[PDB]
Every structure is written in C-alpha cells, then in structure tokens.
Amino acid sequence: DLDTHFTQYKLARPYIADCPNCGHSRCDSPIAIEEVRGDAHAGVIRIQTSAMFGLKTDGVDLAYMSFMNGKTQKSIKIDNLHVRTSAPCSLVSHHGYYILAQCPPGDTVTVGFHDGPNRHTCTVAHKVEFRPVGREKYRHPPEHGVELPCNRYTHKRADQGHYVEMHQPGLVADHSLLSIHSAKVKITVPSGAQVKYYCKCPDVREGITSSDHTTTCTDVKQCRAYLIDNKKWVYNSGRLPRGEGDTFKGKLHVPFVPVKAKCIATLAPEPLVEHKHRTLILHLHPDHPTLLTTRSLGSDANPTRQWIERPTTVNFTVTGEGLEYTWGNHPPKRVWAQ
Amino acid sequence: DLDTHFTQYKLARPYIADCPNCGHSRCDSPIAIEEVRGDAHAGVIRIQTSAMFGLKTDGVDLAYMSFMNGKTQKSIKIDNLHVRTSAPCSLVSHHGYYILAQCPPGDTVTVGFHDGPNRHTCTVAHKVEFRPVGREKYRHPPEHGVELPCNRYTHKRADQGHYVEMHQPGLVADHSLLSIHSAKVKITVPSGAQVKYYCKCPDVREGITSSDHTTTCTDVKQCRAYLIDNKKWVYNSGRLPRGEGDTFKGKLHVPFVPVKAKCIATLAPEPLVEHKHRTLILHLHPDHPTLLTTRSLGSDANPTRQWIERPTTVNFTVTGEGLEYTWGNHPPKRVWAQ
Amino acid sequence: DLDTHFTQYKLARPYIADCPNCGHSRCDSPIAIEEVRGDAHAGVIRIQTSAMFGLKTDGVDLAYMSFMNGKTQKSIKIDNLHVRTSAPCSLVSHHGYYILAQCPPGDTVTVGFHDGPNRHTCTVAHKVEFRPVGREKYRHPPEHGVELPCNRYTHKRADQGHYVEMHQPGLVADHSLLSIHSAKVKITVPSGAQVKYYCKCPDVREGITSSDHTTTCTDVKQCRAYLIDNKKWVYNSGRLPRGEGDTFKGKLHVPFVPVKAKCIATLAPEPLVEHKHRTLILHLHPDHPTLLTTRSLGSDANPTRQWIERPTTVNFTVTGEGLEYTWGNHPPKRVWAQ
Amino acid sequence: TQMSEAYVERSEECSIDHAKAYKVHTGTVQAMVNITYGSVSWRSADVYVNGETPAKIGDAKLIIGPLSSAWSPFDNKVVVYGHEVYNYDFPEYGTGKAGS
Structure with a gap:
C-alpha cells in the first residue's frame, strides 16, 4: 500500500544546495540538510535533507535513494546512509526529503x-x-519503569496532518553546458529543458531553445548557463533561488507528523521511610537527578521542590493537617501525624 | 591449550533474548546484552551477551562467532564485531558469552x-x-608516569576462579513450526527435538513427538508452538522462561576474572617552591584535577586537602614541628623552618 | 606543482615507533603518533604520524600511502584512513609525515x-x-554571522615557513635475521643492507658485514642482529634510537604552517532594549554562552564584564555622562539620559 | 540584488503540544454523595452546591450547600500545559514580548 504517495514520489525530484560544512569546507552537497526538528522526547529527530530518497526512478525500490549529481539525478543503493551526532545515530525510516532517525x-x-x-x-x-x-531527568530510554504520555514523531509515513509546499524550482546555473565551438561558446541542452541564456556582451537575450551558439561573447565565464527544469517540481528551499513565473501546486504532506505517543520512563528506587515524633525522615538514594515535591494539606501549602542527585537525607515537619510527597514519578503518597 | 575448556565450548549453545533497544525498538535480538560489568579501573568493560563468541561448532575457529537465528544456529566469521559507547570502543578478547573491551x-x-x-x-x-x-583525576591512560596497584580484568580466559550456572534452557515458541495441513494446524520438528504442544481447544495435551498434526483447533494463533531443545544448554538468563521440569547443573568458568594488575598512572607537573619566614608558598600548575593533601607533623595534625583544577598559588604556615605535603602521586615531601 | 617537494617526497622513509595505546597495549605501530598540535581556533588539527602519506614508492602520488611493514615499505592506496576523537573526525589533507584534520x-x-x-x-x-x-563560547562554526581574524592551519602544502630536522636512521634491531644452519647461526641481508653481528659467546663482537655467518656462537637467543639502511633518512623522532654518527642535514618543510585566515563567527540575537529613568533595562536571549562587556563613559570607567548563558534581564545605571555596552560580537553602542 | 523574505508560522508540533491560557470565573461546584441511611444502605447521587437544587435519587430528597468558603485555588489567570496546571500570569492576547 506504499504506492498511494506518488505526489511525493513522482512530482518531486532530487535537489542540491549549500551545505555549510560539507566535508572540510562549504561545498554544494546533494544532501544539504535544513529544518531539523529535534523537539520530541524519546531521542528521535526528523531531518529534511535536500536529497529526496524513496522509490526508484519510476515506481520501485523503496530501499533506494535518489540524489542529483550535476545536471542529472542518479538512483543508487542506500548502503551507507549515515546520520551522526556527538555519537553515531541509528536510522529508523525515510520517505521523500525527510528521514527519521534517533540520535x-x-x-x-x-x-x-x-x-x-x-x-x-x-x-x-x-x-x-x-x-x-x-520527573527523573535521565539520559537514555530505560529497560523498564512506568509509561507516560510523551511527544514523539510518528513511526508511520502515510499521514496528512500537515503539508509542505512544492512549487516549481528556480533556474540553476551550470557552466559545463557552455562547450567550445573552436572560437565561440556553444550551450547544449539536457533533454530539451529550457536554458535561459545571455552574456555580458549583446547576444541572444532570453534563451528558450535547443543547443544554441553564442555570436558575441567568447569567454564562458561571462554567460548565463541556466537551466529552467521544472518538469519535476521541488520544495521551496531557502538555498534555491525563486522561479520568477509562479509558485506551482504540489502541496505535499509532511511524512512524519509528531504525535502524542506513550514512552517508557525510568522509575527511581523507593525511598527508605523512617518515622519520628511528628516529623517524617526520608532516607533515599537517587540513581539519577530527580526532583521531589512536598505539599502540606493545611491552609498554608509551604511547598518545596528540590532536585537531588547525590544520596541525601531529608526531613519534614508533618503537622496534624498532614503531609504529602511525590518522590520521582512514583504515585503521590500522603501521611498523617499521630 | 585453547581446547582445554570444553565445558563451555560444546555443552553450551547461544540463544535469543529480549534486547531493550534492538536497532530502533524493543525487538528480540540474538546479541541480547546481560550483566555489563564496568568495575575495572582503566575503563575496561566486560559484557555478557546471549550470543556465544569463541569457537566454531566443535572446537575450532577462534576468529568465528556463533549466534542463534530462529530455531537453529549458524556459526559465521567475526568479520565486523564492534562494541560501542559514546565513542567507539576497542575490543580486546571474546570468549563464550563474554566480551572484553576498552571503552x-x-x-x-x-x-x-x-x-x-x-x-x-x-x-x-x-x-x-x-x-x-x-589521586589524579585524569581521563585516559597516559604514555608515561608512575605505576600503581590498580584493579583490572585480565585478558586471559583459562581461569577457574568463578562459575555461573548453565541449566537446561526453558523451551522456546516457534510459530513457524505451525504450518497448515490444508485445513488443520500442523507442527514439524527441528531434529526430533521435544515439541511441547497443545491448543485452546481440546487436542494432544503434552507433545513429546515427531511432526504431529492438530485434530481440533484451526488457528495458528491458538496453539502452543514450543521447542524443548536442552540437548544443548543455555545460560541462566533472566530473560528466558525456565523449564519447570528441573534445573540442570553444568556451571562453567567465568572467562575474565578481575586481577590486581599494575596500570600506568599519570604524574602531575612538579610544583614551583617559594618561601618566606615560617611560610611555605606553593605554586601549582595542574593539567588535570589532582588532589593535594597537607599534614602538619606537630601534636595537632591540622589536615587540609582540596581538589585543584585551575592553576593556583597556595600557602602554608610551616611551624618548627615541620609540615608534609603530597602533590598528586609524587612521593610526599617534608620541611623545617627558621 | 605537486612534484616540487622532492626533499621530503624522495628522501624520507616511513619509520615505526612505540605507539602508547596500539589497539590493546603499547605495540610498535607503523602509525605511531607524534606532536599533536591542536593550537588552532576553528578546530583544525595537525598530526605528525610515523607513516608517510601521499607518495607511492614510484616517485610521487597522492591517492597512495607509504607505511613500513617489516623491513620494506609496503605502500598501498589510502582508502579508509580514520582520524578519531570523542566523535569521528573528517580529515582535510595529508602530506608525508603530517595529516591535517578537523575534529x-x-x-x-x-x-x-x-x-x-x-x-x-x-x-x-x-x-x-x-x-x-x-566573544561567544560556541561549539561549531555556524552557517552565518560576522567574521573575525582567526588563526588556523592552511590546507596548502607548498610552504617553507618552518623546517624540521631529518638525519640518518639509527641501528634498527631485527631478530628475524638470526637464522641457523643446524651447525652455526647464519646472518642474511635482503638487498644492499650491511647488518651488524654481535653474540654472547667470546667471539668477534663487531661483526659489521654483508651476507655472512657467525664464527663459533650457536644460540640464537644469545645474539643480536642490528640492521643498517642508511640509503634513506627518517624524522628526528623521540621514540627512535639515535644513529651513532652525524646529524645528517636536510630541512623538511612543514606542510601546514599556521596562517592568519578569516573564520565565520557566530552572531548572538539582538538584545531587546527597554528604556527607564536613568536606567537601561536590557532583555537578553543568548543562544550560547556569550561575553557581555559594558563600561561607563565618564571619568570613572566602572567596568562590568560577566558571561551570560541563561536568558536574563540585566540593568545598568546610565548617567548623563553616558554608557557603552558591547553585547556579543555586535559593534559597540552608546546611550544618554535626561 | 537579493530579495529575501521570511515569516513566522506556528510549528507542526502545535497540534499536540501547546500551552492553553485561561481566564476563569467563580463557577459552580458539584459533588457525588453516598447516603447509606436507615435500612436502604445505598445511594449514588450526583449533586450541586447551589442552595436550591433538590436531589431525589432512590426515595430520599435533599439539598446541599452553598459552601461556606469561596476559596478557589485557581487564580484569575490560569495556564494549562497538556496535563499540568500553572497559575502563570500570561500578559494578554497580542502583546507578548519576544523571547518571553
């Protein structure tokens, strides 16, 4: 049932852009990233790469990626798709421009x-x-515990909660189109694609053509080697210049919409309770920084919130009204006084 | 020599268990991790995986590993085994269920x-x-310095210091046994292994057999698809059910017993000493946090110790009874005054 | 061009020294690291390895590496060269002994x-x-922001700002040369070498010779095989025994000298000013810990300098004399009062 | 020349995670009362606190309240975040300071 997303699959094409730190410098990589949404809880990150992986050239090979190299696209294997942070990540799913991974x-x-x-x-x-x-500020999803309503990105892809616009791309330059005709510069076409064309010297001023030659200018470096190639539209990225004509249709659904799932959270060890005369002593040892809250049941709350990391001993004046405390994410407990 | 530990080699066989974060979710990986033992000084780690690393089927191929793929195992090479943490680790030795590495x-x-x-x-x-x-709170073993009696796991494996029980594993479910005899659910056998068998509906109630067929029930999701296969024994893991028949013995030696070895320890830069009447002035230029301790040799000890990280200059009132101080792990020094 | 560096390209030899943490313990690796120089700003590291990168044995190359296994330089295509830190790095360029990487x-x-x-x-x-x-304690070079005169290492190689020494290699030991002929020990030389014969038995102790044999001594473990390969020269490394002769000259230019380049620096968000009677309420929303410096413009400077990381509101008493404050990398500004 | 434009649009995450400002009034309180009087030994009545509404579940009929204390833990301005309630003073609509 993965063939019901052809608007993303067919109407979109691979795309290339300014990666700020492509390798050792700022090259123009085919997988330039943008709008990383690291706002979930379970450590998952949604990344919108310029390269649009998904089905193959026509309709198949979900396990293949298609980036753009030079004038043309190239659908190849996805063997070593690597996502990294301070530590290496692990891929989860990918669809269109967006790849879902946890880091x-x-x-x-x-x-x-x-x-x-x-x-x-x-x-x-x-x-x-x-x-x-x-309440337990841990740092890795634990093996067991209690479940809570976290916020996490949907594992699925066939959702239409939100949409992203895909208009016609804007012309890209490529001076390798400007071949040499022994003493003059000679532009050639990819497949009959539109080549907006003109040079600093006065010559052909629009360029909507097959392979033209240049009468006036000679050096390729002063000529508009442009390709208008909106046979397959792209996302209106901030790294691609705008097509002066119009913003075409192609409203495309966001692949991984955040949803309110239930993550598994840690549970701190139960405190050792010691009772005295009209005072509660909580002998406890936290494994990870957890905040405990206390609240008197009388007229005056006298609340106290305190994150604790090292093992500590605390006290509490339990009045005749009573006292309640919440250690970690355990259920709240109340207490008497004689 | 290396074939003198067949208690573990032939008599034990790796099984599959419930990894907390297998790949991206909680799957049942064949390399399920148990009993991570991070107690050595030099950052050496022992890991007990449910997969059996070491020899081949009978006695050979130290450079091979054996895991369990479904109801049967398949020994392969150790081609790209890797143990990883915040940064990739470096494996040292693998034997049986245990892996030794420096993370x-x-x-x-x-x-x-x-x-x-x-x-x-x-x-x-x-x-x-x-x-x-x-007393020098470094982060990686330096190339030189004075050595100290650390505690660390030994790379050797031919030891008998400790043992762990290896009972007959509990039985395992395999729904892929439950084929269809065109209209009834139908159970095969791996090699004549014991297939515990029964369904919700009343039919064959024990199952100690070759390949049976079901007379009563129809759905593969309403029959017990089990394999008692204790011709080969498994570790007493907390992630496998325990066969109620009986608990086998057959305890095998733990590969890497902790030993009291001698690790190289860092040596802090020596202090610059300066002095005034009955007054030591001490110049310190630590590279890493190192504990400084001082001790007066008079009747009153008057101790003083503090971790120092930033470069600092300290002083000490040196009485005629004399004063001792121990910067880092340099031999203690002592002094008189005028 | 590339081949205009024959002094290091032709004459140098990949040497092998005592890596401190070669895999498990301190072996003798052909890539023994020396003189790590992480003194740049943007995070570019210059590493002087013991292997000789770039040049094939056959004059010069760049897609190849020369490292010494055994007595011979077993050069290969450089293919998967790692440069690791807390997280894996991305190397920039490699030239002979040195390899420049960003970590x-x-x-x-x-x-x-x-x-x-x-x-x-x-x-x-x-x-x-x-x-x-x-002024902003950032972590990674951002996509945009102002630029400042940083200092770092050039990726260029054809420089002669600094030089390093390179003299005759020392007497490398090689036990594998002490073969035996069932009656006496036989020495061997591969090609053009001139080994040294030394044995514990009372015999000729000097033994400088081409292919030859011992006089009387028979126990291999009671002999020494020193190898002489003075045809090439090696770097003056502190982990290699000095040759007993002259400091042969030849200044190998350092491929990557520091230079005064321009790095892109981060740009803190603009503060939200809110004027108040003779008081400058300043709303700040830092993204990363950034320095804030302010000083009165009157006779008394009244300096104030304090790092701010968590968003906070600070206020200053702007007198009629005037006040100046420099938030982050923004240009300084000034203010009055009524 | 470059003509660069940008505008702020609420994130896709707003659909699930979003704070809610609330201004509250006195309102009217309700209670569930159980009365096991006499020989009937049972009741399961939901009731109000206004001093007029009768509650005639089973056979008996009764009237409850009004409460002696007008104490309301909620303040005039209340902020609700998913599951927990904070009596934070949100400024007003269309006046939020940047960053705050």
Missing part, C-alpha cells in the same frame, strides 16, 4: 550516504538534547 | 556484529565511568 | 587506516579543546 545528544548533526567511490557527507551546527518525560 | 567513558553501551546483509545490534542504558588509579 | 572536541586522538586483513591503528592521550574566535 544521542550532541552539538552538531551530520548526514552522509555512500556513492561508493565518494564520501558525500554534510553537517550543520544545531543543539540536540533530549529530556525524558517525567 | 571511552559514556552513558550507553552497545554491542553489534555485522552479518553482511544486516547489522543485528543491541544496546542497553548503563553508564560506564572512568576511575583513574590514584 | 570535534574530545580528550583523545586516534589515527588509523585499515589495510583490510589488519587494522594497524594508533592513539595517544592528548586533550583537544576548541575555542571559537570571538
């Missing part, structure tokens, strides 16, 4: 596939942190 | 081989800290 | 290709800290 906390996020003879990596600076849902 | 400090531990078409990794939330031998 | 913050640096049947890696304990140029 450990870190200061930067990197994405890189493998063509096989090439590395082709890209990264960006972006704070990534993940506080688990609950 | 950087970090909060999560992962173990994963590479079958070649799939990764099949596992990970568990379990912090691993670094505890430098001595 | 994330960490406390250990490890280098290693993986020749395939074997790994041959090496690490060393050395903290690496990356202070971005400017």
Whole structure:
C-alpha cells in the first residue's frame, strides 16, 4: 500500500544546495540538510535533507535513494546512509526529503550516504538534547519503569496532518553546458529543458531553445548557463533561488507528523521511610537527578521542590493537617501525624 | 591449550533474548546484552551477551562467532564485531558469552556484529565511568608516569576462579513450526527435538513427538508452538522462561576474572617552591584535577586537602614541628623552618 | 606543482615507533603518533604520524600511502584512513609525515587506516579543546554571522615557513635475521643492507658485514642482529634510537604552517532594549554562552564584564555622562539620559 | 540584488503540544454523595452546591450547600500545559514580548 504517495514520489525530484560544512569546507552537497526538528522526547529527530530518497526512478525500490549529481539525478543503493551526532545515530525510516532517525545528544548533526567511490557527507551546527518525560531527568530510554504520555514523531509515513509546499524550482546555473565551438561558446541542452541564456556582451537575450551558439561573447565565464527544469517540481528551499513565473501546486504532506505517543520512563528506587515524633525522615538514594515535591494539606501549602542527585537525607515537619510527597514519578503518597 | 575448556565450548549453545533497544525498538535480538560489568579501573568493560563468541561448532575457529537465528544456529566469521559507547570502543578478547573491551567513558553501551546483509545490534542504558588509579583525576591512560596497584580484568580466559550456572534452557515458541495441513494446524520438528504442544481447544495435551498434526483447533494463533531443545544448554538468563521440569547443573568458568594488575598512572607537573619566614608558598600548575593533601607533623595534625583544577598559588604556615605535603602521586615531601 | 617537494617526497622513509595505546597495549605501530598540535581556533588539527602519506614508492602520488611493514615499505592506496576523537573526525589533507584534520572536541586522538586483513591503528592521550574566535563560547562554526581574524592551519602544502630536522636512521634491531644452519647461526641481508653481528659467546663482537655467518656462537637467543639502511633518512623522532654518527642535514618543510585566515563567527540575537529613568533595562536571549562587556563613559570607567548563558534581564545605571555596552560580537553602542 | 523574505508560522508540533491560557470565573461546584441511611444502605447521587437544587435519587430528597468558603485555588489567570496546571500570569492576547 506504499504506492498511494506518488505526489511525493513522482512530482518531486532530487535537489542540491549549500551545505555549510560539507566535508572540510562549504561545498554544494546533494544532501544539504535544513529544518531539523529535534523537539520530541524519546531521542528521535526528523531531518529534511535536500536529497529526496524513496522509490526508484519510476515506481520501485523503496530501499533506494535518489540524489542529483550535476545536471542529472542518479538512483543508487542506500548502503551507507549515515546520520551522526556527538555519537553515531541509528536510522529508523525515510520517505521523500525527510528521514527519521534517533540520535544521542550532541552539538552538531551530520548526514552522509555512500556513492561508493565518494564520501558525500554534510553537517550543520544545531543543539540536540533530549529530556525524558517525567520527573527523573535521565539520559537514555530505560529497560523498564512506568509509561507516560510523551511527544514523539510518528513511526508511520502515510499521514496528512500537515503539508509542505512544492512549487516549481528556480533556474540553476551550470557552466559545463557552455562547450567550445573552436572560437565561440556553444550551450547544449539536457533533454530539451529550457536554458535561459545571455552574456555580458549583446547576444541572444532570453534563451528558450535547443543547443544554441553564442555570436558575441567568447569567454564562458561571462554567460548565463541556466537551466529552467521544472518538469519535476521541488520544495521551496531557502538555498534555491525563486522561479520568477509562479509558485506551482504540489502541496505535499509532511511524512512524519509528531504525535502524542506513550514512552517508557525510568522509575527511581523507593525511598527508605523512617518515622519520628511528628516529623517524617526520608532516607533515599537517587540513581539519577530527580526532583521531589512536598505539599502540606493545611491552609498554608509551604511547598518545596528540590532536585537531588547525590544520596541525601531529608526531613519534614508533618503537622496534624498532614503531609504529602511525590518522590520521582512514583504515585503521590500522603501521611498523617499521630 | 585453547581446547582445554570444553565445558563451555560444546555443552553450551547461544540463544535469543529480549534486547531493550534492538536497532530502533524493543525487538528480540540474538546479541541480547546481560550483566555489563564496568568495575575495572582503566575503563575496561566486560559484557555478557546471549550470543556465544569463541569457537566454531566443535572446537575450532577462534576468529568465528556463533549466534542463534530462529530455531537453529549458524556459526559465521567475526568479520565486523564492534562494541560501542559514546565513542567507539576497542575490543580486546571474546570468549563464550563474554566480551572484553576498552571503552571511552559514556552513558550507553552497545554491542553489534555485522552479518553482511544486516547489522543485528543491541544496546542497553548503563553508564560506564572512568576511575583513574590514584589521586589524579585524569581521563585516559597516559604514555608515561608512575605505576600503581590498580584493579583490572585480565585478558586471559583459562581461569577457574568463578562459575555461573548453565541449566537446561526453558523451551522456546516457534510459530513457524505451525504450518497448515490444508485445513488443520500442523507442527514439524527441528531434529526430533521435544515439541511441547497443545491448543485452546481440546487436542494432544503434552507433545513429546515427531511432526504431529492438530485434530481440533484451526488457528495458528491458538496453539502452543514450543521447542524443548536442552540437548544443548543455555545460560541462566533472566530473560528466558525456565523449564519447570528441573534445573540442570553444568556451571562453567567465568572467562575474565578481575586481577590486581599494575596500570600506568599519570604524574602531575612538579610544583614551583617559594618561601618566606615560617611560610611555605606553593605554586601549582595542574593539567588535570589532582588532589593535594597537607599534614602538619606537630601534636595537632591540622589536615587540609582540596581538589585543584585551575592553576593556583597556595600557602602554608610551616611551624618548627615541620609540615608534609603530597602533590598528586609524587612521593610526599617534608620541611623545617627558621 | 605537486612534484616540487622532492626533499621530503624522495628522501624520507616511513619509520615505526612505540605507539602508547596500539589497539590493546603499547605495540610498535607503523602509525605511531607524534606532536599533536591542536593550537588552532576553528578546530583544525595537525598530526605528525610515523607513516608517510601521499607518495607511492614510484616517485610521487597522492591517492597512495607509504607505511613500513617489516623491513620494506609496503605502500598501498589510502582508502579508509580514520582520524578519531570523542566523535569521528573528517580529515582535510595529508602530506608525508603530517595529516591535517578537523575534529570535534574530545580528550583523545586516534589515527588509523585499515589495510583490510589488519587494522594497524594508533592513539595517544592528548586533550583537544576548541575555542571559537570571538566573544561567544560556541561549539561549531555556524552557517552565518560576522567574521573575525582567526588563526588556523592552511590546507596548502607548498610552504617553507618552518623546517624540521631529518638525519640518518639509527641501528634498527631485527631478530628475524638470526637464522641457523643446524651447525652455526647464519646472518642474511635482503638487498644492499650491511647488518651488524654481535653474540654472547667470546667471539668477534663487531661483526659489521654483508651476507655472512657467525664464527663459533650457536644460540640464537644469545645474539643480536642490528640492521643498517642508511640509503634513506627518517624524522628526528623521540621514540627512535639515535644513529651513532652525524646529524645528517636536510630541512623538511612543514606542510601546514599556521596562517592568519578569516573564520565565520557566530552572531548572538539582538538584545531587546527597554528604556527607564536613568536606567537601561536590557532583555537578553543568548543562544550560547556569550561575553557581555559594558563600561561607563565618564571619568570613572566602572567596568562590568560577566558571561551570560541563561536568558536574563540585566540593568545598568546610565548617567548623563553616558554608557557603552558591547553585547556579543555586535559593534559597540552608546546611550544618554535626561 | 537579493530579495529575501521570511515569516513566522506556528510549528507542526502545535497540534499536540501547546500551552492553553485561561481566564476563569467563580463557577459552580458539584459533588457525588453516598447516603447509606436507615435500612436502604445505598445511594449514588450526583449533586450541586447551589442552595436550591433538590436531589431525589432512590426515595430520599435533599439539598446541599452553598459552601461556606469561596476559596478557589485557581487564580484569575490560569495556564494549562497538556496535563499540568500553572497559575502563570500570561500578559494578554497580542502583546507578548519576544523571547518571553
């Protein structure tokens, strides 16, 4: 039933852009990333890469990725699609421009596939942190505990909660179209695609053509080697210049919509309760920083919130009205006084 | 020599268990992780996986590993075994269910081989800290310095210091036994292994057989599809059910017993000494936090010790009774005054 | 061009020294790391390995590596060369002994290709800290923002700002040369070599010779085989025994000298001013810990400088004399009062 | 020349996670009362506190309240975040300071 998303699959094409830190510098990688949404709880991150992986050229090979190299696209294997942070991540799912993965906390996020003879990596600076849902500020999803209503990105892809617009792309330059005709510059076409064309010298001023030659200018460096190729539209990225004509249709659903799932949260060890005369002593040992809250049941609340990390001993004046305390994400408990 | 530990080699067989974070979710990986033992000084880790690393089927191929793929095992090479934490680790030795490695400090531990078409990794939330031998709170073993009596796991395996019980595993369900005899649910056998068998509906109630057929029930999701296969024994894991028949013996030696070895420890830069009347002035330029302690040799000890991280200059009132101080792990020094 | 560096390209020889953490313990790795120089700003590291990168044995190349296995330089295609830190790095360029890479913050640096049947890696304990140029204690070079005169290492190689020594190699020991002929020990030389014969038995102790044999001594373990290969020269490394002769000259230019380049620095969000009677309420929303400096413009400077990380509102008493404040990398500004 | 434009649009996560400002009034309280009087030994009545509404479940009929204390733990301005309630003073609509 994965063939009901052809609007993303067919109407969209692979895309390339300014990666800020492509390898050792700022090259123009085919997998330039943008709008990483690290706002869930379970450590999952949604990344919108410029490359649009999904089905193959026509309709098949979900397990293949299709990026754009030079003038043309190239659908190849997805063998070494790598997503990294301060520590290496682990892929979960991918669809269209968006790839869903979970990462450990870190200061930067990197994405890189493998063509096989090439590395082709890209990264960006972006704070990534993940506080688990609950009162126990842990740092890795535990094996057991109690469940709470966290916020997490949907594991599925066939959803239409939100949409992203895909208009016609804007013309890209490519001076390799400007071949040499022994003494003049000679532009040639990819498939009959539109080539907006003109040089600093006065010559052909629009360019909507097959392979033209240049009468006036000679050096390729002063000529508009542009390709208007909106046979397959792209997302209105901030790294691609705008098509002056119009913003075409192609409203595309967001693949991984955040949903309110139920993550499994940690549970702190139960405190050792020791009773005295009209005072409650809580002998406890926290495994990870947990805040405990106390609240008197009388007219005056006298609340107290205190995160504790090292093992500590605390006291509480339990009045005749009574006292209640919440240690970690355990259910609240109340107490008497004689 | 290496074939003198057949108690574990032939008599034990790896099984599959419930990894907390297998791949991306809670799957049942064959490399399920148990009993991460981060107690050595030099950051050495022992891991007990449910997969059996070491010899081949009978007695050979130290460079091979054996895991369990469904109801049967398939020994392969150790081609791309990797144990990982916040930063990738470096494996030292593998034997039986246990792996020895040297990991950087970090909060999560992962173990994963590479079958070649799939990764099949596992990970568990379990912090691993670094505890430098001595009084110098370094982060990695230096290339020089004075050695100290640390405690560390030994790379050797031919030891008999400790044992762990290896009883007959509990039985395992395999719904792929429950084929269809065109209209009834139908159970085969792996090699004549004992197939405990029964359905919700009244039919054959024990199952100690070759390949049976069902007379009564119809649905494969309403029959017990079990395999008692204790011709080969398994570890007393807390993730497998225990066969109610009886608990077998057959305890085998633990591979890596902790030993009282001698690790190299860092040596802090020596202080610059300066002095005034009955007054030591001490210049310190630590590179890493190192504990300084001082002790007056008079009737009153008057001790003083403090961790110092930033470069600092301190003083000490040196009485005629004299004063001792121990910067880092340098031999203690002592003094008189005018 | 590339071939205009014959002094290091032709004459140098990949040497092997004592890596401190070669895999499990301190072996003798061909990539023994030396002189890690992480003194740049943007996080670029220069590493002087013991292997010789770039040049094939056959004059010059760049897609190849020369490392010394045994007595011979078994050069190969450089293919999977790792440069690791707390997180894996991304190398920029490699030239002979030196390899320039960009790393994330960490406390250990490890280098290693993986020749395939074997790994041959090496690490060393050395903290690496990356202070971005400017007033904002950032972590990674951002996509945008102002630029400042940083200092770092050029990727260019054809420089002669600094030189390093390179003299005759020392007497490398090789036990494998002390073969026996069932009656006496036989020495051997591969090609053009001139080994030294030394044995415990009372005999000729000097034994400088080409292919030859012992006089009387018979016990291999009671002899020494020193090898002389003065045809090439090696770096003056502190982990290699000095040759007993002259300091042969030849200044190998340092491929990557520091230069005064321009790095992109982060740009803190604009403060929200709110004027108040002779008081400047300043709303601040820092993204990363950024320095805030202010000073009165009157006779008394009244300086104030304090790092601010968590968003907070600070206020200052702007007198009629005037007040100046420099928030982050923004240009300084001034204010009055009524 | 480059013509760059940008506008702020609420995140996709707003559909699930979003704070809710609330201004509250006195309202009217309700109670569930169980009366096991006489020989009937049972009641399961939901009742109000206004001093007029009768409650005639089973056979008996009764009237409850009004409460002696007008104490309301809620303040005039209340902020609700998913599951927990905070009596934070949200400024007003269309006046929020940037960053706050």
